[PDB]
Amino acid sequence: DTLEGSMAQLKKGLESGTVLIQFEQLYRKKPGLAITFAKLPQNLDKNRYKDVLPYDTTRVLLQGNEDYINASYVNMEIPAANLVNKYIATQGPLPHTCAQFWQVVWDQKLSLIVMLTTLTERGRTKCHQYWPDPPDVMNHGGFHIQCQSEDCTIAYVSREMLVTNTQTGEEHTVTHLQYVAWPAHGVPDDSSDFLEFVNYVRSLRVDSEPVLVHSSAGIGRTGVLVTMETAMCLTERNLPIYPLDIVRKMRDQRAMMVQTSSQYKFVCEAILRVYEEGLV
């Protein structure tokens, strides 16, 4: 089909109820994909949530290092545009997984981290603070981390971080965006702030470099962000958008991406809004 046609069907299906029914029918975890490493005794407490685990096939491995991390490669292709948007989707680090988190960032010289959670919710810790408050310097697994800049906007905090390899003396800079106006299991507090943030993240991509995206579990709010970026690329290229195909494609790489029906409805509505705003 076409962008126009897909948007007609999405509009109609939003009004029907059919897009939500097909969403609830979709598997959360792809049947047949092995999940073994994540459940080993030495790895169980490296998962923030017992039921949010990486598939073996797309699990991120540390270079020449056997340590496990709960993280998944997630790549979204737009073949008609010879385009692949790469991500590493991961959980909020735990105190004892900060070393592995920063090792992924170092291994792959990732320049952009997108964090879609506050540190705490309702008196409980949802992500370890794996960076230091400026101007402190923090050690994690033989990386020193310092926050060189910290600036708050409405909806998010932008930090520039310096990662130093203690073994080698090498340095790497990372941009870190913490979206703080988006509670777990919910929709963003403001749709317009969210859309602007997504387009800002797009603009900060480095060629063929994955964006590291995480939340607390790294599936709900991350899935929404990924869905939206994908849809923005498609809409700008006049290509059809099937949100269910996009969610399925993510879930073939990391189970459970896009947690709630309310999140799926939100992103479908936002996709329609962007198409219509942009339509000439």
């Binding site: 407490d45 998962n47 949530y49 017992k50 299991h185 579990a217 709900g220 459970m256 709630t260």
Partner: peptide, 6 residues
Amino acid sequence: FSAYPS
């Protein structure tokens, strides 16, 4: 170990 809440 806890499940991710709904």
